[PDB]
Every structure is written in C-alpha cells, then in structure tokens.
Amino acid sequence: SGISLDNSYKMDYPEMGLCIIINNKNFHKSTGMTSRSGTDVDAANLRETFRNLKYEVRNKNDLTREEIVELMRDVSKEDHSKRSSFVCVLLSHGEEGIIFGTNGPVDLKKITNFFRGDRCRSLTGKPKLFIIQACRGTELDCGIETHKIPVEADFLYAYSTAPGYYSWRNSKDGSWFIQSLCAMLKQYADKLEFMHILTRVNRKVATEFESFSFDATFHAKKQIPCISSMLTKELYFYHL
C-alpha cells in the first residue's frame, strides 16, 4: 500500500468502549457532605452525549467508596479487546487527588491505577479518559477584567477545575464544566481532535460562567478547567 501515518489512536474497533458514569448525589449523613443538586442534569447530559458517540454507557448512582473501588476493579478486569477506548466520568464531592464515595473518600490514583498499561492489558495502547467534576481544594478564582511503553501512558484526565480550586455546580443547570463539555462534544466531536474540543470547553467555562451568591466570599467567582494529557496520539471520536 501507500505511505501510512501513525499519529492518531485507532478508533475503528468494533466498539468505541465503555463510558462509566458515577453520579454521587446523596451522601451518608455522618460524612457531613451536602446533596449535589443539579448532578442528575449532568448525568443525563453525559449519558446522551456519549450515547451519540456510540459508547456503551453505564450510569451508577450513589456508590460508596467500597462500591466505587469494586466497580472499577471489575471493569478493569473485563476484556476490552474489541473496544477502542475507555471513559470514566466521576461526579462527586472532592479534594485534590480525591473523589468521595457516599460514605467517604477514594484516592483518584487508586481508581485510575486499575487501568495502567501493565494491569489492564486489553486497554494497553488505548486512550483511557477520566473526566472529573469535583472540587480540588477550596481556593476561589476572583478573575480579572478584560518495559516497552510507560504504565502511565495513554491516560487523559479532564479536570473541571484547576489544582487547589473549588469547582462550581449550578443546582438548576448542572455543573459549568459538564454543561460545557457536553455542548462542545455535541458540536465538535465529528470535526475536532479531542484536545481542541477540551480547549473550547476551557474557553466556554472561563468566559460564559460567573458565580452569583449572597455571600461575598463566594460571589463573582470564575473557573478554568484543567486538561492533563498523558496521551501519545491524537484522539478523534470519528473514523474514516
């Protein structure tokens, strides 16, 4: 055949892959965590968005930390040979490096480690996408006026917010990040490489959202999401 190029992940396996959505809305009272009003809007938007990208979507609601770990363990032990990619969406309370089950926290690294190149062989060399709507701390953005491949290769973490910062969720509309992400996937998944889609999400969140609060501490705050890419190739959700 003619000249071949190798710059983009193979996305024409028989299946696009799984999209696991963990939607934690109601937390055990002893944790002292509030209910995450609006997260069902996020979860439904994500389900439809990734359905249209031909992912096998599984929605899970109100999982304990133990159920989160077992679910991700079990999913990492499936045979993904016929799947192009893997997507996991986490919607919950969080801190830097941490996502909350309904009864307590889970280390993000414990979740993602199940899918390391050496621990999930049927996803080796395939893009593993983790999309995280959760706080990464308590800072507020005031804004300004205008040995063959590494085991950590081929992961992408699409964080809703910068390191150390709160993340914003509207109780009526859903979270700023998930809203924008779904809208940009809807508009551009058949046209743009994934990093360029996520860059549009960055701009949409940064420019179109600002908090409104009766509490001066939390009023008029801004947010920028945070793309963390260990991918080794371009990622297009379509193929030729």
Partner: peptide
Amino acid sequence: DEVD
C-alpha cells in the same frame, strides 16, 4: 451556584 454551589461548590463541589
């Protein structure tokens, strides 16, 4: 608007 609420924080996570």
